[PDB]
Amino acid sequence: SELLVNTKSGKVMGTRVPVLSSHISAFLGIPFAEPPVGNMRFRRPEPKKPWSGVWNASTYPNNCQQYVDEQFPGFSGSEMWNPNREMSEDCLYLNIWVPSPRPKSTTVMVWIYGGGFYSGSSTLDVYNGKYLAYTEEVVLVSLSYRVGAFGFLALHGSQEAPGNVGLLDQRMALQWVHDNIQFFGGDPKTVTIFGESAGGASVGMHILSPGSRDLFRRAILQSGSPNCPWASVSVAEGRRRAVELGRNLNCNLNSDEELIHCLREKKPQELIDVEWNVLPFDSIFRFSFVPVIDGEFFPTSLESMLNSGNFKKTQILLGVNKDEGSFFLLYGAPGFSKDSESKISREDFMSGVKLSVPHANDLGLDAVTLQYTDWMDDNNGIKNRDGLDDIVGDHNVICPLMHFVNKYTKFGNGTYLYFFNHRASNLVWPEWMGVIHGYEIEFVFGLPLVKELNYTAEEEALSRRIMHYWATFAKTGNPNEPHSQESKWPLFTTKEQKFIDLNTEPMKVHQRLRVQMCVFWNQFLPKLLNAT
Amino acid sequence: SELLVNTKSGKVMGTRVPVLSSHISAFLGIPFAEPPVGNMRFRRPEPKKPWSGVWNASTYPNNCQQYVDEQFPGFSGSEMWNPNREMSEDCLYLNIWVPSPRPKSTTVMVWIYGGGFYSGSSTLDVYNGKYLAYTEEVVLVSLSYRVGAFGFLALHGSQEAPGNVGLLDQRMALQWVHDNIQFFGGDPKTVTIFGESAGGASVGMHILSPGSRDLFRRAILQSGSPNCPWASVSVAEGRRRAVELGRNLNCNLNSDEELIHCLREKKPQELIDVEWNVLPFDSIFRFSFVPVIDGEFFPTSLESMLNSGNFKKTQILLGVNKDEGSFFLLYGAPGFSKDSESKISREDFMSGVKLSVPHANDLGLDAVTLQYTDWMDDNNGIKNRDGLDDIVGDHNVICPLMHFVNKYTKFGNGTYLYFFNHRASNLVWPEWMGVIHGYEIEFVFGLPLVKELNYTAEEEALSRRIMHYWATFAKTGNPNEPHSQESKWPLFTTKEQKFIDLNTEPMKVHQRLRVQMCVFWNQFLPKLLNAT
């Protein structure tokens, strides 16, 4: 039977699931590690001990213990991102959708979810791999990993809480795919890791980390890259936040051993309730427990690794959405609301600017203001709103990614860059937020192919295109079909820097994605701050 | 007879001249000072001693001793600016065109020529006042003043060469108009001074200088303002250049008295031949002998006078041409030629930038480059050319003037701002130079009204408009006619900052003339240099 599979750790029994008037096989909730519970909290993951009998892999597993967004209770725009299963520290599981009948050896894609390293779930409806596996004849894995303090509490020099264990979670899932995916009809030689935002930064991190490079063939990054300002902290800052967590929880702070014993003594929700309190003064665009530049997982600084070519050299496919700052402003910047147009005074604009670069001196603040003000009229509320939105997205997502794209292309074996600027017709978030970060994912997983979802027919075509770009890139390292007849997505080169738009209109090619702004953030503003 | 006039210094006999199928009276070459010759070289002007008999005022006088441009021998574009009369140190004369028959009391306009304080003549064909006097029923004066070392050698603390004597030349001409213009049918209560570039800066200077304010009613500035970087030097720099002149000429440099005695001993052309040698290292956009901030003519620094309201408060009408940097680049920047399109490499662009701000540190150079580069393609020769042209014009003319406009409007009694962006159809200078500095003057003097000149009929209309704007402003302090029916030129206010385009198309109103760039030059780049 095609729903039974022997793996190096035991038999698993999957379930037959329907998809677009057909059916495929799904293996939900396969364990890939020992449950990181008890005195294993904070520790590096251990592999799942082998089990006798058959593992019931017919239903989704628990989500990891995380913060849950309650800003807009009952609102679908926010709750579609929350855990839809019971939360638990026993959460290290993966899911697999296998085409029917079981292929002999086909391309594998491993999804890494985002959520700022403080949240995320492999079981969300937008991450349901059955449409992609079915439409494109791939094996679709989605892994899970510890978020929050549970996965990124960094007390460097200790071995009970070294940091980065959530990335080690992802690595173990990749090791598991390498060792077992053959039995599910997946080709372990042709594994593409892809992920969005925090998962995009994660993919990039795996490309950099020597201990991860041999576990996958190529990589896709969506709206995230490892050098993003929110995606890592220094060893000193991670230790400061870990101590600050213990102070919030009446923990003996004398030794790492005693700090950690107290943190292990706590219930999961106690850690979560206080985790935003360890942030520095400027915290509106930051997350508490993120990967740490530890000299182990990352041998040196990310920038020196990028400069010296110290990273896996393969093909990469990556891009951004038009409006990457909108959620940051809505959730954290005073003056933005879900239900207003969020027009911004000249006064409110200056504050946003200050918030955006809180360590800039007066000269740096003036530089950002000069760069993003419409001087033909200062007090246009919509212009001020759009300008602040551009600041936040450029500085936290787009220009980090562009920096990563440029450094990587000097050494890699093929870069493909995209700019996704189509707002879904059925988007429930307000109009001012635009082409929102995260709202290309539904196209990548083929949600528009489902009629009930209320997408337009041109949105079904786009999704079909994007799924085919993605899966063709995964199979061959080029998103374009061999000598087909549609518009070709050109290689991103150092001298020409071409990229494409992804939207419902016919594809056109452009060059130099937001280069003026990225030159400001990546080259100019650093030099100005290092000189005052 | 209407060609004879008694003045406080003697009788003058003018000549009848034809103009546009009519005739007016012209009084050419009236002396307003003692000839500044011999041991009067460098000295403040003395008034013309009264003469017996009748002064033959039928022919143009001598031009002052100046550098003569020979870059393009026989080329009309350059030679129309050179002295068209014999040069002489005996040059302090003025010219008057009086409508026929002689009015009883009509508006007076006094032209101050430009030429960077090193050159210029009141007798050029583009400065012929007969079309303006005739068409608009004004009395047209054009004065003259010592240029070069003869008018601006500044040895502060001495009384033999204090500096600014060329501005004192202009002041004496204004004093003469105040005292005598009544006899020519001009209204001494309604005198408008106007001038272009160096003469525009001169007009502004008269507005600032307490000893000049009572000699005129209102003022017009074209492509020049007193705070322009090329328009004044400090007392220390003027003394340095005066000594450096003596070093070039084998002069005893022990005392001011001996330095000056040697300089007086020289022939005029000896001073001219060496005058560009006293410039500092960065000299391509500078002129050797310019007005000096001396504590006398200018009580304090120009900027403090502008801040504190220390200046004559009246109506002003001023503006710029679209392409103010073109002559600077053609004559001084390597890579520009009269007969090529002057496309500029990326390499040549950086040099221009360096030349433009030679004292900027590396950070300042990057700031200008970021501000003016087209980053969508760096190596477009036409873009690089236009960008450098914009840099030079913004920094040396447009943004100084805009700074002057903003400070003045806070205290004055009415500002009118214009942007002249029509390239004359018959312009002999190359196309890449654009709407060139200086090529609105022919429109202000009504040259297009003369058919032989080969202007289009729409250029005749524009000239008619501009002459009427100018002369109506001179008569009433508002360029617009009382409740007429054409488009009104709105007042420039601090909050709205409206200006008009002047061209052959119907007039439209805009706001905030090059405010982004002017904010860069006037506010941002200063703060950045004061901080490194």
Ligand SMILES: O/N=C/c1nc(CCCCNc2c3c(nc4ccccc24)CCCC3)ccc1O
């Ligand atoms: O961005 N919203 C910011 C934000 N929220 C809240 C409400 C949720 C409670 C804390 N929750 C979050 C915090 C922060 N960042 C978050 C990002 C996503 C979800 C919750 C966050 C940063 C500062 C500390 C708290 C309060 C203040 C905020 O400043």
Ligand SMILES: O/N=C/c1nc(CCCCNc2c3c(nc4ccccc24)CCCC3)ccc1O
């Ligand atoms: O701008 N041309 C610049 C320029 N010319 C020449 C040829 C004319 C001789 C000097 N003559 C002028 C100079 C300068 N500025 C001038 C401006 C107008 C007319 C003559 C000038 C500045 C530097 C010293 C010489 C040589 C070098 C130049 O660098």
Ligand SMILES: *[C@@H]1O[C@H](CO)[C@@H](O)[C@H](O)[C@H]1NC(C)=O
């Ligand atoms: C697997 O678990 C689900 C939910 O507990 C249950 O309904 C299902 O019958 C189980 N399947 C097997 C084969 O035990």
Ligand SMILES: *[C@@H]1O[C@H](CO)[C@@H](O)[C@H](O)[C@H]1NC(C)=O
């Ligand atoms: C990728 O690598 C192969 C060699 O393995 C090389 O021939 C090819 O040109 C490379 N492509 C790019 C875009 O670097």
Ligand SMILES: *[C@@H]1O[C@H](CO)[C@@H](O)[C@H](O)[C@H]1NC(C)=O
């Ligand atoms: C689709 O649209 C209908 C309105 O016709 C609405 O009732 C339904 O809830 C929508 N479905 C989704 C999934 O939004």
Ligand SMILES: *[C@@H]1O[C@H](CO)[C@@H](O)[C@H](O)[C@H]1NC(C)=O
């Ligand atoms: C004035 O001078 C000119 C030129 O020298 C001469 O031709 C003219 O006749 C003179 N006029 C009188 C009235 O002397």
Ligand SMILES: *[C@@H]1O[C@H](CO)[C@@H](O)[C@H](O)[C@H]1NC(C)=O
């Ligand atoms: C100019 O001054 C008069 C008073 O003399 C005043 O009434 C008028 O409003 C002023 N106009 C401007 C534009 O300042």
Ligand SMILES: *[C@@H]1O[C@H](CO)[C@@H](O)[C@H](O)[C@H]1NC(C)=O
């Ligand atoms: C006007 O154009 C004619 C050509 O028809 C030319 O010969 C003449 O010199 C031009 N006149 C001027 C003043 O440029």
Ligand SMILES: [Cl-]
């Ligand atoms: Cl086996």
Ligand SMILES: [Cl-]
């Ligand atoms: Cl379905």
Ligand SMILES: [Cl-]
């Ligand atoms: Cl390497």
Ligand SMILES: [Cl-]
């Ligand atoms: Cl900052």
Ligand SMILES: [Cl-]
């Ligand atoms: Cl970069």
Ligand SMILES: [Cl-]
């Ligand atoms: Cl008299």
Ligand SMILES: [Cl-]
């Ligand atoms: Cl004529």
Ligand SMILES: [Cl-]
């Ligand atoms: Cl005053």
